[PDB]
Design a protein that fits this description.
homodimer; Aspartate Aminotransferase, domain 1; 17% strand; binds pyridoxal-5'-phosphate; alpha/beta; pyridoxal phosphate (chain A); PyrdxlP-dep_Trfase_major (chain A); adenosylmethionine-8-amino-7-oxononanoate transaminase activity (chain A); EC 2.6.1.62 (chain A); transferase (chain A); 7-stranded mixed β-sheet; Aspartate Aminotransferase, domain 2
């Protein structure tokens, strides 16, 4: 089909996630047709650099014919069987075993889902069930943060701190609370980032004491906030969050849906920041987005509590789906065996971070240049010296993002933050290629900003 | 790996849906390895008849090499791309256009998810967003039924009426209410099925008036309740439910996750019972379980309402997944082009129903022998005359289902209901082959009752 016709059929029959349906159907959808390595092509024939790896998830990049073969082979033998009827199958068994190999010690039990959002809902139910098993029925509140993102189920949307999501669904559901996010640029006042990390972590302590520790089940956080704009907390933050959770007997949960499977150069974001969660949620990079699968990695304390609780009345038809498991297995084994994660840690991550900071250092309206491993970002700001953001946060970021897309580069705006998370397998030449397009785009952005008299 | 090898790793590493992990680990998990047609082979080389089609979902049967090729092909060109970025891709656009021709009139727009549960969650947010768009911020309560099943998200479980689920996660969440299920055998008193259907339906009107109609956003129901035990509502039930919903400006939603894609003989469960829902949820048969994919089909009125509301701040990374959509597309085309649904209505459904009753009616403790299309059930009872159920609904079903298990037959126990939902492509010879193992299991079962002091 042509561009115009695929656009016509999409506008007529498709409801997109997180989209203005009326305005999209007017402008027309951009039709992505094929991918190879770090590159995409659209229906018009534009070669595009995918500086977002699909949706933070295509970690091995596009073009894995071995993954298609793994999919074909498994679908031919057993395309589906359920894990509900005192039943299992070799693909789910073999994946579970492999995951145990690459996860830290103590994470041997895994619960499968189809998505990061289902993993979060599963985790919420696990956390609350755990406290019931302990005879503490009031210990049910989960604390997340403003501008955190934990998916799109009613449960995950409530635990998330996106107001725009809360306003649709009568959210949050009860037993949720939120603390401010560890965003130093906005909230740091005259503290050092490290002083600020302690302050921002102790917001959890003061929330717990406001609520009553006996009512708090868990604190949940993305090691680095992804959708909120790659907010990288100070080094002092996570160890203090962990101290506080242990002080008050509150479960500690990492949402690893973005940071997992090598994004920071460790296998998991929590390893980078050096905390030890009781559970963590995954998806995305688990299969590099090649098939839908998510998981909850359940540490020993909680797993023992759940196993002591008899039946766990939860799950999805497609939990442990054999074909998705086969592809995840192929993916995880590749991340290990081809040295992809190790390469982020030791080679391409430090290169990207260095180049990133070199690239964006000069611009008058770029600040808070940050990142680690293969996730990185900056913020477009009104005045650097005053740490002053643009009003209507998001307007300026959108203008910038539009310059990127027109220049065949995918980087995302989260408010006025610009973020990137390319395939981990990106080469040095491809990093420089990407950064070259980005830099030219920021030159144009700075020129347009002065021209608008938005100076 | 051997049986014991697989079992040991499963106990060590895998937490299963809807399971007592301690006791599954102690017993050892049954390891399913391969499937063909309507049969499975396990780690021990038994030939097992799959009268549950995976999990009500393997509708075109096992062994569809053409599906594996569609998957392979799509995975090689573009294994993934997001639909969040003012972006789309051929496979999702193509599936969307195909669905609109097999779904009833006025269902042009689909929202993709990965699962039935996520579909239910999406439907809940849609219902509530819709009423906000309509300037009715109080119109937010969804009504389900006791023993209805709407998945396993916190939302779906709340809308669901399984007490055993509500007990885990602090459910239901707010703006959820529940009415009694149209289960004649227990609630029929002295009414005829058709009379009770009117009464069981009016329970909805009662609940609405109690809550207040201005607070009520939707009534949601599976056309035939599945996981609750294939409860088939009287013919009078759904039309009254629809009148009531229309009387009080309450949205009618069908959960078609089980009944969808040919299961009763129509494409959808609601078509069989002749109501017109404003939205309906789907998964399972959409891809015949070959790849995870679900959907919410939005009727014209609601679609109009959601579009007027600008941004819909909802969705999943793998929404519209290219590879799942290609496989869904190949499955839907197959169900239609290969005439598998049509055959359920005309050919195999009637046969299955007649023969089912013929096989099971004659038993002492088998009553309420029911079913339509390729979904069918019966209930294990203490006394047929008294409509007396066994004490502690569930004990007897297990005892019985465990006989099936060691006779290489899969039919599921829902309380003391026995249910079956085999692939739609099952042949008459297969139908007869399955019932014969069942009859013998039953003959065994009834005898084991007496020899126990019953
Ligand atoms: C994207 C995301 C999720 C939800 O995952 P889905 O697969 O889209 O349901 C949850 N947590 C985090 C941190 C995410 O980035
Ligand atoms: C199985 C089921 C669901 C949930 O679908 P999953 O894909 O398992 O999340 C929802 N509604 C009904 C009627 C179902 O049978």
């Amino acid at each position: 089909r042509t561009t115009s016709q695929w656009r016509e059929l999409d506008a007529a029959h498709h409801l997109h996630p997180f989209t203005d349906t009326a305005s999209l159907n007017q402008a027309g959808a951009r039709v992505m047709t094929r991918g190879e390595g770090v590159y995409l092509w659209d229906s018009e024939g534009n070669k595009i650099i995918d500086g977002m790896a699909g949706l933070w998830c295509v970690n091995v990049g596009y073009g894995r014919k071995d993954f298609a073969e793994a999919a074909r082979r498994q679908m031919e033998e057993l395309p589906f069987y359920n894990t509900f009827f005192k039943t299992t199958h070799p693909a789910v068994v073999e994946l579970s075993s492999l995951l145990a190999e690459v996860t830290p010690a103590g994470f041997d039990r895994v619960f499968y889902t189809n998505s990061g959002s289902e993993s979060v809902d599963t985790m919420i139910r696990m956390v609350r069930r755990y406290w019931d098993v302990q005879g503490k029925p009031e210990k049910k509140t989960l604390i997340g943060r403003w501008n955190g993102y934990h998916g799109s189920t009613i449960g995950g949307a409530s635990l998330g701190g996106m107001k725009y999501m809360h306003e649709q669904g009568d959210l949050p559901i009860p037993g949720m609370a939120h603390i401010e996010q560890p965003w130093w640029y906005k909230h740091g006042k005259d503290m050092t980032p490290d002083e600020f990390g302690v302050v921002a972590a102790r917001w959890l302590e003061e929330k717990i004491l406001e609520i009553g520790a006996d009512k708090v089940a868990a604190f949940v956080g993305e090691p680095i906030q992804g959708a909120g704009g790659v907010i990288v907390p100070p080094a002092t933050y996570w160890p203090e969050i962990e101290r506080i959770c242990r002080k008050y007997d509150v479960l500690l949960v990492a949402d690893e849906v973005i940071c997992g499977f090598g994004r920071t150069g460790e296998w998991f974001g929590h390893q980078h920041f050096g905390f030890q969660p009781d559970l963590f949620t995954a998806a995305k990079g688990l299969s590099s987005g090649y098939l839908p699968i998510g998981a909850v990695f359940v540490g020993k304390r909680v797993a023992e509590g759940l196993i002591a609780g008899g039946d766990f009345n939860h799950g999805f038809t497609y939990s442990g789906h054999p074909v998705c498991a086969a592809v995840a297995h192929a993916n995880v084994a590749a991340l290990r065996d081809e040295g992809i994660v190790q390469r982020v840690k030791d080679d391409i991550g430090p290169y990207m971070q260095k180049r990133w900071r070199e690239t964006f250092s000069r611009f008058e309206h770029v600040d808070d240049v940050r990142g680690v491993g293969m996730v990185q970002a900056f913020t477009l700001v009104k005045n650097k010296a005053k740490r002053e953001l643009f009003p209507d946060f998001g307007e300026i970021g959108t203008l910038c993002r539009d310059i990127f897309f027109r220049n065949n580069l995918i980087m995302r705006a989260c408010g006025d933050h610009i973020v990137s998370a390319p395939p981990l397998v990106m080469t040095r030449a491809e990093v420089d290629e990407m950064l070259a397009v980005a830099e030219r785009c920021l030159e144009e952005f700075e020129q347009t900003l002065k021209a608008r008299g938005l100076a």
